[PDB]
Amino acid sequence: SMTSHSWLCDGRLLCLHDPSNKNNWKIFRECWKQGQPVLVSGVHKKLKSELWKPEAFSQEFGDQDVDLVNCRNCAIISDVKVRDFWDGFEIICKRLRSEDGQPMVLKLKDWPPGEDFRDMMPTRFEDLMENLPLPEYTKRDGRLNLASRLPSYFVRPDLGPKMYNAYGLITAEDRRVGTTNLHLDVSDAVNVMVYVGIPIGEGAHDEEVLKTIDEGDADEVTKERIHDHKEKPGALWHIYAAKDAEKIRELLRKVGEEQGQENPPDHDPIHDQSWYLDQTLRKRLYEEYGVQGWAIVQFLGDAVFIPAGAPHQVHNLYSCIKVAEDFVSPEHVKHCFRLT
Ligand SMILES: COc1ccccc1N1CCN(CC#N)CC1
Ligand SMILES: [Cl-]
Ligand SMILES: [Cl-]
Numbered sequence: 001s002m003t004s005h006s007w008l009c010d011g012r013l014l015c016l017h018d019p020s021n022k023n024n025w026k027i028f029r030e031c032w033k034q035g036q037p038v039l040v041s042g043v044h045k046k047l048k049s050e051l052w053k054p055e056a057f058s059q060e061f062g063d064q065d066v067d068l069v070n071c072r073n074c075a076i077i078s079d080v081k082v083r084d085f086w087d088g089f090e091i092i093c094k095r096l097r098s099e100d101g102q103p104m105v106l107k108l109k110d111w112p113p114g115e116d117f118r119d120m121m122p123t124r125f126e127d128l129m130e131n132l133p134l135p136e137y138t139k140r141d142g143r144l145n146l147a148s149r150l151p152s153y154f155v156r157p158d159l160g161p162k163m164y165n166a167y168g169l170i171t172a173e174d175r176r177v178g179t180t181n182l183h184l185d186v187s188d189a190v191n192v193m194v195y196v197g198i199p200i201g202e203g204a205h206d207e208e209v210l211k212t213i214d215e216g217d218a219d220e221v222t223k224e225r226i227h228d229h230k231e232k233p234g235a236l237w238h239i240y241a242a243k244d245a246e247k248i249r250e251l252l253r254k255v256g257e258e259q260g261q262e263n264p265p266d267h268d269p270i271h272d273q274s275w276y277l278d279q280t281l282r283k284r285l286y287e288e289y290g291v292q293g294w295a296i297v298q299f300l301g302d303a304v305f306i307p308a309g310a311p312h313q314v315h316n317l318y319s320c321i322k323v324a325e326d327f328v329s330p331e332h333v334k335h336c337f338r339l340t
């Protein structure tokens with residue numbers, strides 16, 4: 001039976017099932033006011049699937065110059081062509097190699113660059129922005145988006161959307177690495193999974209993906225989405241309440257000190273965007289600081305809503321294309337105010 005919603009993370013996470021349901025705001029606003037993230041499934045079924053394929057991005061934009069990051073060591077690969085990223089997205093033998101001769105796990109940095117998404121890709125912009133869930137919150141001019149309505153006393157978000165493209169992490173060693181490290185944003189955001197690429201050549205890599213989800217602390221209902229519905233999992237997220245951000249800074253200052261980093265007592269390890277919380281660090285956060293987060297697996301078509309101020313990290317299970325839009329809800333406007 002088709003239902004309006006379900007309750008994940010032992011009823012700590014709302015999951016809306018109809019992205020265009022005009023009554024979604026009634027369930028949403030109760031969870032959102034408490035500072036929780038929210039998941040909306042099914043956005044892929046609203047989109048023109050031919051506009052979101054890696055082959056189309058290579059053919060249309062392949063000659064542009066870009067930088068890439070090696071996710072395993074943070075090294076920057078300077079001034080290559082964007083086709084050099086897209087042509088290895090699913091075919092492992094076509095990826096750029098590290099010194100050791102391994103194919104690299106790569107992230108495409110800042111592409112499209114700055115605020116150019118709309119100028120470069122007008123048809124993709126229309127397709128995404130017309131099908132975003134909770135449109136009164138998420139549209140540039142929605143009635144509950146204050147982004148265009150605030151004075152300079154508030155940090156306003158840039159013009160979006162922004163695209164996040166990166167390979168999947170592969171090995172047992174890769175379990176401790178982030179695609180995007182732990183950080184926070186002063187605006188609200190919605191992040192849509194528009195394509196998941198499950199490779200070939202070293203296709204048969206299914207088992208390490210299951211142990212990553214398991215050790216990642218994912219709930220039993222999340223595991224049923226793979227085994228029972230055969231949905232495509234893209235990325236594993238950890239998200240923490242905005243109110244827990246300083247306790248996370250105290251843990252990371254203490255670990256930095258144990259590892260012989262030399263840091264002023266006041267430096268900000270969350271703003272540094274230098275840490276990924278592995279199973280050891282997450283257990284320490286829980287046991288020593290009393291902090292519990294949300295472990296979320298974002299499948300093809302899932303929209304993740306991230307509250308302003310909430311620290312969060314992302315680990316790609318397979319190759320992903322994500323598209324994100326910033327907004328300023330009235331519930332969370334305190335997080336972007338420039339005083340006190
Ligand atoms: C999305 O979150 C859930 C949580 C708990 C149980 C099921 C789901 N869904 C409902 C059906 N949905 C589309 C279909 N068919 C995929 C799986
Ligand atoms: Cl809040
Ligand atoms: Cl376009």
Ligand SMILES: [Cl-]
Pocket residue numbers: 025133134135136137
């Ligand atoms: Cl709405």
Ligand SMILES: [Cl-]
Pocket residue numbers: 178179180181273
């Ligand atoms: Cl990062």
Ligand SMILES: [Mn+2]
Pocket residue numbers: 183184185
């Ligand atoms: Mn972010």
